[PDB]
Design a protein around this ligand. Structure first.
Ligand SMILES: COCc1cc2cc(c1)C(=O)N[C@H]([C@H](O)CNC1(c3cccc(C(C)C)c3)CC1)Cc1cccc(c1)OCCCCN2
Length: 377
């Protein structure tokens, strides 16, 4: 019955993927951002300039007040609100209803996005990073406890405004080609993984593999960019600059501020390298790689000028909190969050990114010695 969940995600480019949900009795419909990088289910519950609708607890006969406050600070945005429970359903999801913890957002700062069309957030990661603490059961944990939905979900994020699928409770084989390759979930808090090797246009960055995971590496559908630790970011930018040196860019482009443009259809994709991330595999001394095309890390942005050219933002950012495999990495892959077996699977998506001579890929097996040494402690 997974066909009912195909294409159940929508979004505007750079503004997050959201799924339709209902909360309360009678059901109140809200669009909910899909976020594997946090663990709180929270919804707008008060008027806001950027909200077209919000959760009205007074109108729901099944609402229960938990008489506890809550706040969540993300990288830049944050909200605070009031904890409660209510009945929750996903119209284009499994035919179930769960009583879930809900943070009713009453104030926020740089959290809601003008025009994003979503009014709440579904944190899909584990309780360990839930606020105020890990006793607040996350939505997916509630779903799995109260129903027969299997303990896994899969995300097919399709690029560009944008669409995709969140398959709740399983894997839909019509959404990917080739084989699924699995990497262990290192620890159940974020969806933490271990990167064991990085290549750019086939050239190994040749860093201590601990640098790739300093201080963690995670899969985060709620963050747009590939975000890399300082040392890795500098090595990668230097290599990407060298490969594209025939053209000149503002250096604020490499910081993610200035967008670069070319005459519509003349974008020189061939001068930007492919990036291969090798992930720890399921068996001893075995890894696999995913290969990222420049069409993933050069994100298209609407040109502010009257010219209708092709303009792009550099979607690789420097991080001080580890590697983030964000939505632009996930796009074009089918990503299986197999919580029951503590693993994350990658396969080439049915909605894959199209280069002329190159293709995004998930390939294995590879042999990599001492993979355990790549995790940071
Ligand atoms: C370059 O960095 C800026 C940046 C860009 C983006 C998202 C975040 C940060 C963002 O903050 N993302 C968090 C995720 O939950 C973030 N997940 C992380 C995180 C970071 C800090 C604290 C927490 C805890 C709440 C678990 C989690 C692990 C990385 C979820 C989120 C919150 C608010 C608005 C969002 C997304 O909009 C989605 C569209 C924009 C996506 N790009």
């Amino acid at each position: 019955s997974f066909v009912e969940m195909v294409d159940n995600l929508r979004g505007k480019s750079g503004q997050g993927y959201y799924v339709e949900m209902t909360v309360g009795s009678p059901p109140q419909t809200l669009n909910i951002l899909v976020d594997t990088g946090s663990s709180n289910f929270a919804v707008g519950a008060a008027p806001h300039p950027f909200l077209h609708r919000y959760y009205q607890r007074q109108l729901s006969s099944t609402y229960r007040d938990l008489r506890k406050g809550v706040y969540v600070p993300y990288t830049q945005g944050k909200w605070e609100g009031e904890l409660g429970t209510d009945l929750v359903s996903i119209p284009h999801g499994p035919n179930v209803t769960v009583r879930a913890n809900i943070a009713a957002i009453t104030e926020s700062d740089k959290f809601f996005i003008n025009g994003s069309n979503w009014e709440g957030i579904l944190g899909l990661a584990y309780a360990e990073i839930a606020r105020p603490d890990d006793s607040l059961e996350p939505f997916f944990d509630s779903l799995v406890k109260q129903t027969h939905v299997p303990n896994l979900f899969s995300l097919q994020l399709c690029g560009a405004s944008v669409g995709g699928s969140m398959i709740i409770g399983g894997i839909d084989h019509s959404l990917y080609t080739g084989s699924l390759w699995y990497t262990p979930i290192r620890r159940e808090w974020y969806y933490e993984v271990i990167i064991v090797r990085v290549e750019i246009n086939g050239q190994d960055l040749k860093m201590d593999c601990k640098e790739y995971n300093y201080d963690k590496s995670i899969v985060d559908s709620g963050t747009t960019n590939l975000r890399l630790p300082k040392k890795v970011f500098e090595a990668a930018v230097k290599s990407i600059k060298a490969a594209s040196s025939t053209e000149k860019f503002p250096d604020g482009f490499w910081l993610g501020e200035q967008l670069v443009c070319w005459q519509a259809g003349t974008t020189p994709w061939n001068i930007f390298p492919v990036i291969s991330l090798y992930l720890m595999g399921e068996v001893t001394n075995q890894s696999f790689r995913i290969t990222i095309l420049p069409q993933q890390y050069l994100r298209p942005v609407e040109d502010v000028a009257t010219s209708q050219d092709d303009c792009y933002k550099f979607a690789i950012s420097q991080s001080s909190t580890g590697t983030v495999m964000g939505a632009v990495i996930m796009e074009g892959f089918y990503v299986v969050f197999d919580r029951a077996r503590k693993r994350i699977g990658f396969a080439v998506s049915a909605c894959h990114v199209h280069d002329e001579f190159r293709t995004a890929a998930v390939e294995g097996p590879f042999v990599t010695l001492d993979m355990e040494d790549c995790g940071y402690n």
